[PDB]
Amino acid sequence: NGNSADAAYAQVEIQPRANIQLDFPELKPYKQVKQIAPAELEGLLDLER
Amino acid sequence: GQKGGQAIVVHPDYLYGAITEDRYNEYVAKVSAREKSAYKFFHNGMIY
Amino acid sequence: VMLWKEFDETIFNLPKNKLVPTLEAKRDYIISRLNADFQKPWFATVNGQARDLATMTYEEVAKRLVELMFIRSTNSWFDVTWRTFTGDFLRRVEERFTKSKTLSLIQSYSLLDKPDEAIEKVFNAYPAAREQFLNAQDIDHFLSMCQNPMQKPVPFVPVLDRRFEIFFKKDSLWQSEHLEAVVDQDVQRTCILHGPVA
Amino acid sequence: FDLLNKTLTFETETEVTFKNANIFSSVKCFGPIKVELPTKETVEIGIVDYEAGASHGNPVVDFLKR
Amino acid sequence: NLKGRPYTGWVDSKTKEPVDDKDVKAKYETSILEHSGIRLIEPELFNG
Amino acid sequence: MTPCTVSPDFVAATTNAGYTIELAGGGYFSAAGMTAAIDSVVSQIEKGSTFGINLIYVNPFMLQWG
Numbered sequence: 332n333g334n335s336a337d338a339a340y341a342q343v344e345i346q347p348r349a350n351i352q353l354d355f356p357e358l359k360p361y362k363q364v365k366q367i368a369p370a371e372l373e374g375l376l377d378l379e380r
Numbered sequence: 381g382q383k384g385g386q387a388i389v390v391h392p393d394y395l396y397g398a399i400t401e402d403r404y405n406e407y408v409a410k411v412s413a414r415e416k417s418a419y420k421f422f423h424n425g426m427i428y
Numbered sequence: 429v430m431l432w433k434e435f436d437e438t439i440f441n442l443p444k445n446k447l448v449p450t451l452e453a454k455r456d457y458i459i460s461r462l463n464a465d466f467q468k469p470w471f472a473t474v475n476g477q478a479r480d481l482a483t484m485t486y487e488e489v490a491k492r493l494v495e496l497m498f499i500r501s502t503n504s505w506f507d508v509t510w511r512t513f514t515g516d517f518l519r520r521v522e523e524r525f526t527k528s529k530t531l532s533l534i535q536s537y538s539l540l541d542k543p544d545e546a547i548e549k550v551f552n553a554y555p556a557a558r559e560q561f562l563n564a565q566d567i568d569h570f571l572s573m574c575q576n577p578m579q580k581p582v583p584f585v586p587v588l589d590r591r592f593e594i595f596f597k598k599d600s601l602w603q604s605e606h607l608e609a610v611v612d613q614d615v616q617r618t619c620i621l622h623g624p625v626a
Numbered sequence: 627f628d629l630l631n632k633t634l635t636f637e638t639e640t641e642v643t644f645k646n647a648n649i650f651s652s653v654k655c656f657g658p659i660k661v662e663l664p665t666k667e668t669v670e671i672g673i674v675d676y677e678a679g680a681s682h683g684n685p686v687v688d689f690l691k692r
Numbered sequence: 693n694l695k696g697r698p699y700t701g702w703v704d705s706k707t708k709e710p711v712d713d714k715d716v717k718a719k720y721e722t723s724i725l726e727h728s729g730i731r732l733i734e735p736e737l738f739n740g
Numbered sequence: 741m742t743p744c745t746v747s748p749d750f751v752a753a754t755t756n757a758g759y760t761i762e763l764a765g766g767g768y769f770s771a772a773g774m775t776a777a778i779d780s781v782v783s784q785i786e787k788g789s790t791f792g793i794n795l796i797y798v799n800p801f802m803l804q805w806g
């Protein structure tokens with residue numbers, strides 16, 4: 332059948348390269364993050380302090 | 381020399397409870413942009 | 429050609445030591461004029477907004493390659509080597525964003541003959557790459573693929589550096605016969621050679 | 627036939643027809659298979675019989691060569 | 693160029709032979725661990 | 741003329757119109773590439789027709805295969 336028949340057969344493998352990340356924290360959607368803290372906290376703190 | 385110390389660190393997601401949805405979403409956008417730029421800076425600074 | 433003329437009188441005549449400083453000073457203007465007026469646009473411009481390779485996502489780059497190299501009107505890659513380019517580029521995306529050895533989602537660059545779908549396939553598997561600028565190493569790899577001499581000169585300027593004149597002037601005769609593959613099929617961008625007396 | 631510790635010889639002719647410069651349209655490879663006796667005399671014990679359409683090669687000669 | 697062929701990526705600092713990220717662990721991890729963390733004091737790191 | 745008379749079609753058309761034309765080496769990068777274009781011109785022109793080739797002296801790579 333020739334080296335053609337079994338060259339259009341043999342899959343192509345992908346080896347990983349490193350992709351170093353800064354790992355900034357994940358920001359969840361507001362609806363979900365507002366459940367964590369009490370409802371009352373909104374506008375209660377001086378955020379400069 | 382009697383140097384006692386304690387710090388308490390609280391999870392950062394307790395902060396976002398204090399602000400409005402509008403303000404949070406603006407922050408999330410701004411961080412996301414800054415983070416992409418920091419990754420750009422870091423990898424360039426590392427290899428060179 | 430009038431931009432080409434200005435750049436002859438303004439940039440390509442400057443002594444080598446003054447080339448790179450003038451390029452950095454007029455950077456935004458040069459990009460603006462390439463995009464507006466020339467047959468090789470600034471590669472790194474996304475939704476008509478100027479960028480650099482370093483400030484485009486893997487997805488933005490893959491899409492920009494298809495935008496400039498794949499001719500919608502003829503539903504084909506203007507040259508097979510341009511397909512090989514964006515094929516090799518997508519394989520890099522898989523390499524960078526896979527966490528371990530797997531089989532490529534592009535087993536044959538044939539798949540690129542429906543390019544929109546090829547892109548969706550790869551970035552659906554590696555969605556992280558929609559949200560991250562090019563790793564600095566992959567910028568150098570992209571710019572290296574652009575120097576590949578076994579391939580039709582890339583139809584854009586990927587970087588402003590010492591070799592700007594070669595990027596600008598290289599392979600600029602064919603566009604007048606293949607407007608279908610020029611940015612707005614716009615004659616006004618292209619080199620047509622013609623005598624003033626004939 | 628007990629083949630163990632025997633020496634076989636393969637006396638083979640191969641007839642071929644062509645599709646083009648590279649691909650054969652047909653490939654035939656036949657001839658007797660012989661066993662060596664204690665006397666060193668080779669004796670027929672069977673036959674090679676290969677027949678094929680479009681091939682790129684003769685897999686009998688390839689096998690016997692290796 | 694690395695021996696007339698063009699190359700982008702890691703290279704062993706001594707040999708200047710190219711190195712794939714996939715091989716970094718097999719090639720260097722044993723040495724990384726041997727010469728990281730709490731270990732015998734290496735004089736070249738503290739002025740002899 | 742590079743963009744213009746690189747096209748084997750236009751070379752054949754001009755040759756078939758009964759006028760001498762130069763096939764432009766300018767648009768070719770290998771012996772194999774031009775051999776294919778020449779073959780196309782030959783296939784399109786009448787028996788006993790002819791054309792010429794233009795090579796650029798200032799391009800030593802074209803000269804060395806050309």
Ligand code: NA
Nearest residue numbers: 348350524526
């Ligand atoms: Na990875």
